[PDB]
Design a protein around this ligand. Sequence first.
Ligand SMILES: [Zn+2]
Lengths: 287, 51, 286, 70, 191, 94, 159
Amino acid sequence: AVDTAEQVYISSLALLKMLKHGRAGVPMEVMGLMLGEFVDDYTVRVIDVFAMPQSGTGVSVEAVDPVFQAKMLDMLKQTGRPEMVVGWYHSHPGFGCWLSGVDINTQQSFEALSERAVAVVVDPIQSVKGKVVIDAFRLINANMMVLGHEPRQTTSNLGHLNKPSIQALIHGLNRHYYSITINYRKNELEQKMLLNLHKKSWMEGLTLQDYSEHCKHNESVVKEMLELAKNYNKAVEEEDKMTPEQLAIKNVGKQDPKRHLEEHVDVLMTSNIVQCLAAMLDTVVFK
Amino acid sequence: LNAKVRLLREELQLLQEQGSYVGEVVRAMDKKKVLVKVHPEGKFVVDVDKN
Amino acid sequence: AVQKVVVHPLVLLSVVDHFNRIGKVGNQKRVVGVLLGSWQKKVLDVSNSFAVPFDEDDKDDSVWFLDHDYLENMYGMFKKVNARERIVGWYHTGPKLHKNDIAINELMKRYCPNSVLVIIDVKPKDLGLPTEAYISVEEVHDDGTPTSKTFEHVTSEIGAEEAEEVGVEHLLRDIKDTTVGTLSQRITNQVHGLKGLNSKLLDIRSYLEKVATGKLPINHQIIYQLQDVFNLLPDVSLQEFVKAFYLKTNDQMVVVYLASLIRSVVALHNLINNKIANRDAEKKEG
Amino acid sequence: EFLHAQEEVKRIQSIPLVIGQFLEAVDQNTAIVGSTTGSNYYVRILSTIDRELLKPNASVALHKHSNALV
Amino acid sequence: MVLESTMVCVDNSEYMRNGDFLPTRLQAQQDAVNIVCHSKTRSNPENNVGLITLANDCEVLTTLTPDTGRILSKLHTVQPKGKITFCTGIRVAHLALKHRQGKNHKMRIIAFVGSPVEDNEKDLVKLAKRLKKEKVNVDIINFGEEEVNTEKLTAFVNTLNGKDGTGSHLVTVPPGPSLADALISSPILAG
Amino acid sequence: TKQYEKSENDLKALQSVGQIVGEVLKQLTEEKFIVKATNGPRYVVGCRRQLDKSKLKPGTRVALDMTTLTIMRYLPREVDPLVYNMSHEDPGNV
Amino acid sequence: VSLLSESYNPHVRYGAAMALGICCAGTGNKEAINLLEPMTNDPVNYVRQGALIASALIMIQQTEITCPKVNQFRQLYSKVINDKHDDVMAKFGAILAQGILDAGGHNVTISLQSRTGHTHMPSVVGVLVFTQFWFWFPLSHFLSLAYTPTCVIGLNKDL
Ligand SMILES: [Zn+2]
């Protein structure tokens, strides 16, 4: 009866399990289950994500095993957090994550047990890394087609969510379905260490080991690697010294390009890496 | 420069469903329409094109 | 045997969040769970894991007990959903292990031939790369004492494959990445001296402390031997290190010359094209 | 945010793609490219690398629908 | 039916290898384990019963579970050699009872002590006052040989509970030959 | 009576669509396989973990997904008229 | 703020249109209007809305003879609301802006600075809560306190 703008609070642990369970199923679409708590109608949060076992029949409304749920919920009841399940998610690896006739068939099953049961779709493919990626859906009632279907209140998040639109298949879900916003929450402590873990991964353990191994490198074959840089500086420059003359022939910067052009920036940056890692010698080797 | 990476997104959207074709005019017509023949396809006839 | 291990941020987080599970209910001790590893080569890799309820009585301060049936059912579920995943060992959040942890490995050694235990740290503080990795082996001794089981250190590194790099790099939204060539090498250059110092300084305070308090042993045997190895290197000129001077500078010779070589070229293209595009473009407008 | 924008241009389309034959670039920012479907298409060139890998004739991999050079 | 979780403790101490019980204490107490596990089966299906070894270093062979197949599997080739350990033998059962799923199930422990113990009176009094706070009720049945007319354990059970608590009953075996199945007849009829 | 239900349960497995055939031209990376359909179009796709990457090889008949367009199952060889070239029969001998 | 109005994200462009809206509403500055012209042309939806309300605060009690863009804008307000292709979001602030220009039957305006030299707190408080009208729709009524009467009262004394 009451329809409002919605919001999904995700946990740092949740997304990581989403994209993993989805990566192992490629190409075939998997079946996950969303775990969290319903705080009210206009907001929702997902505090946990657990993986379901695959089946040979595939994604289906019968793919959820009741005995598996009671077992897993045993393991979650004895855990510090025995929170009730909320909704379900499935991966859509090879396309633009549109809900199919199989997804709707299990939507009406979750809407009778759970009032909301937010539908979530996650795919690793459509995003290299830094995208927020994922997706989220909600089933609107089809029997309401006689009354007003056009909420919400606080239309801000509605406007940013429906955008960009973004092709056609995405718009084909505006009817019978509506999306729901997603926003991260911190949890900034563990996030701080989670940054330093990957960053320190590139760093050494003792930190004096691989830098001194790059000092063993600092004269290898580095005089030979500097001969590699010397050949790039002869070969690229004697053909980039004809370019100031050719600029007088074409008059002046019309297309072009050749190329054979620039590329000395990378040569200077690699030579600068060489001279700095070499400058570490006098610091390290000495005391 | 931040606007160019956004421009690639919108431009991608216009070229995504159909991109753009390559036509060959066999004849031009009096109604401002232009008979165009595509290599893989059959002959069309299409109009202004104000530019 | 085992050389190095790779622990993903996903499974690591899976330890931390369970620390939030038992955090609200408390109370004492530390989180203890069984690690799920993936072994593709002599190098070890970890993907996921599962927590297990564990409680240590105090009377009984060396009493430790795990759930075997729950272990069976949960590992059976993870073997069902993932055929490649298997238990490589166990893990605890420490921060420092206790003498009692020697038998914990001996229990589950029926599950895996060699079970590697991985300490972790839920609260990042010091002194650098986190967690830890230990392998259970028997080196005996030259004394002829009964065989003593002492865990040996295995170098650990944080890594990932593909999808697990996505979320990790996405959630930070903090520091520049990387950036190679400018601020990647210099910051780590200070990290080399800083993390070298504090490691050496805490441990070298330990060495002075070990002879005053902590005896026995301590010292001997392992201490004096590595002591003389530390006295193996002064380590400078005389002599040949004098001769490395001018060839290091001579390695800088061509580098400075190449520098000044392209510096004039940058100024060339920039100044020429810009001054033309400045005055010749403005003269047509006004 | 600019370094973060580089990932926005590499993000699309990641995988997968459809091969075609590069024909020629009619100008800067857009080209004509023959698809493996056997059709020449007026198509934009990706804003990152427009130049060194172009070449007069080379097999180029395109997005399924957009036929976009990558 | 009454809700509870029982934890049985089999006696593997080096004094149980003798044949004073017919035919041997190993098979005698094994048949005792069969009758108690079938008794809990006839009581309630929800009650689950694991086992714990008291001798040498205590280890849980079978975690708390409603099926007795695993229990009967571990009774065999147990290799009963070692020194009995008592003070930690109740606390281990309590340790597995803190990890239980059901909070409605009451904590109950049964143990068989067939060897003398070196536990001092102060240690046992501390555990008595501790189990009062934890409310845990332990029903012990003494087997084997010990101090004639066992005293320390008897007073341990009496001082462990009070008002009523009806309760914990310690049945001491009299020094005479008899079949084990006839010794379990009195405890199985009434606590 | 129950055998019928066995068949009907087989239909539930028939709700899975047939995959699309193709060949392996090369592979650019482990997540980039240069493939071609028997109908002519060429594609580059990644694949799942159930493959053995070395087993792939160039010039390999494979089956692709209907959306991801990637290898799930594969078969080495097929030919229609062969068994019919083998189906000739003649008496004798004698 | 001219350069912040050119920012890549429309969130800062929205705040940047609002700054010129609320600060310059007591003035007839034309530079502010000039920077708010391209804002309604941005392809982002809500930033256009922001330009509507801001341009509604610069034109309070000011007729066409004040700045030449008054009618220019007044046709745009109705144009965006009668077109079905436009976003419902952008056409909300259109009729809302028509309400700003016509507030009190054109007889009243908003003034954050009395001539005495002190700021009027019901005005400021009303408008600042009115900053985000999405999050709570009844918060749009607090703008009524910002409306102040502009009149010449020649009452001599008493009644
Ligand atoms: Zn689906």
